């Protein structure tokens, strides 16, 4: 199978160096160019540069020339992207992709899976979990909303379930927001029958593996 396999998720601090990799398999790596593509959060695709691993010839984008180093080790069928001094603005998904030759010429015909790179001054921190309690005005015989606010954690991700996975219908776990503090925050909510509020227990289960923080919050009416 023809594939490109990229290295794992990175979380770094400004000023640190970083080298990420892209290994080809299932084809003759030294016969095709590889490109690197940046995708900043919420943004589109940007071409960074090409390298020909067979001889390490490089063709950089003008935007990235002198900002990053693209290299290759053909003995390992691997291309690399390197920074000597990261900036928070380097936070992005990085893709490597093969340039077509013969078939699909000059296009990106095979893509790696992406490497997510987060650069921040923040330090690993587990979340605080707070209830979003169902309203006392909840419509009788109607629908109520309740939830959990998962505040002030770094880095992503957190996972949330409800009732140990038994409650899934009506659940919305929002994408995290980055706060001005440099810490992330999200809410998970669920809509349930108002008549269930007296009889059914609702517990959100939160796990933040990076800080090894695991919390269960029972959410009930005031």
């Amino acid at each position: 199978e023809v594939q490109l396999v990229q290295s794992g998720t990175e979380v770094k601090k400004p000023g640190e160096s970083l080298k990420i990799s892209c290994k080809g398999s299932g084809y003759t790596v030294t016969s095709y160019w590889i490109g690197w593509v940046r995708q900043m959060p919420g943004k589109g695709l940007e071409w960074m540069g090409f390298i020909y691993p067979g001889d390490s010839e490089t063709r950089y984008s003008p935007t990235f020339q002198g900002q990053v180093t693209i290299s290759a080790d053909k003995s390992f069928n691997t291309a690399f992207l390197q920074w000597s001094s990261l900036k928070a603005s380097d936070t992005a998904m990085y893709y490597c992709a093969r340039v077509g030759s013969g078939w699909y010429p000059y296009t990106f015909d095979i893509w790696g899976q992406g490497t997510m790179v987060t650069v921040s001054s923040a330090s690993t921190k587990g979340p605080s979990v707070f209830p979003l309690a169902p309203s006392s005005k909840s419509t009788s015989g109607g629908t109520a909303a309740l939830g959990c606010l998962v505040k002030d954690y770094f880095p992503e991700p957190v996972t949330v379930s409800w009732n140990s996975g038994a409650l899934t219908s009506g659940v919305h776990t929002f994408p995290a927001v980055l706060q001005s503090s440099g810490l992330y925050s999200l809410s998970s909510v669920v809509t349930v029958p108002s008549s269930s509020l007296g009889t059914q227990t609702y517990i959100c289960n939160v796990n933040h593996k990076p800080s090894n923080t695991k919390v269960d919050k029972k959410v009930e009416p005031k």
């Binding site: 160019w33 695709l45 000059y106 296009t107 015909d109 939830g147 606010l149 919305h172 995290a176």
Partner: protein, 214 residues
């Protein structure tokens, strides 16, 4: 570098109907134009190259046309797996390549007004010195909505953040949260907390509110 401009930014089309996405080049590029599909969390994938040729796995409902400076990608009958972001890429004189900024193709359905809920800060949080007030807009369509926070009738600006879900795979709706962040001291000095929601499915804006301490 050759600038590629895609339009529209977001295209809303019903399942089973035809979508036409556009991409304009700032200089002629003959037929040296590719299109990629990208879904959230996933790498892009090549769909069309040399302006009009499908890659091997790509279903016949996808086509492309154009030459010079104007190009289109058409999807003649939309299936659920087709809703995604699409990017064009020129390669007139490789290695000089550039991408368009993308078009998001989302599912059109009937308008659904949001159900709105407000949540006060928890007493536990207040011990921390900060108060978060949360407004939920649940299961609405289209995505566009306006949320305004008011504290003792003063409009708040700059102290809230929103998050929105991806479009739901079963009902094609969105949900949105808005979180107002205030110091405990400020929270405890004011009484009425309100979030006003404006959406094209609501004849007039909906306000949900609470009085601190009640």
């Amino acid at each position: 570098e050759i600038v590629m401009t895609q339009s529209p930014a977001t295209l809303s089309v019903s399942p089973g109907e035809r979508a036409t996405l556009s991409c304009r080049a700032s200089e002629s590029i003959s037929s040296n134009l590719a299109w990629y599909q990208q879904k959230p969390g996933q790498a892009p994938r090549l769909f069309i190259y040399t302006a009009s040729t499908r890659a091997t796995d790509i279903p016949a409902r996808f086509s492309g046309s154009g030459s010079g400076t104007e190009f289109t990608l058409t999807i003649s009958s939309l299936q659920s797996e087709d809703f995604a972001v699409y990017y064009c890429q020129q390669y007139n004189n490789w290695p000089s390549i550039t991408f368009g900024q993308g078009t998001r193709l989302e599912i059109k359905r009937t308008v659904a007004a949001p159900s709105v809920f407000i949540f006060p800060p928890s007493d536990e949080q207040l011990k921390s010195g900060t108060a978060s007030v949360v407004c939920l807009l649940n299961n609405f369509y289209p995505r566009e909505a306006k949320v305004q926070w008011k504290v003792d009738n003063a409009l708040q600006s700059g102290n809230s953040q929103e998050s929105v879900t991806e479009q739901d795979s079963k009902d094609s709706t969105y949900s949105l949260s808005s979180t107002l962040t205030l110091s405990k001291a400020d929270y405890e000095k004011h009484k009425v907390y309100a979030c006003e929601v404006t959406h094209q499915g609501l004849s007039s804006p909906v306000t949900k509110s609470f009085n601190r301490g009640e």
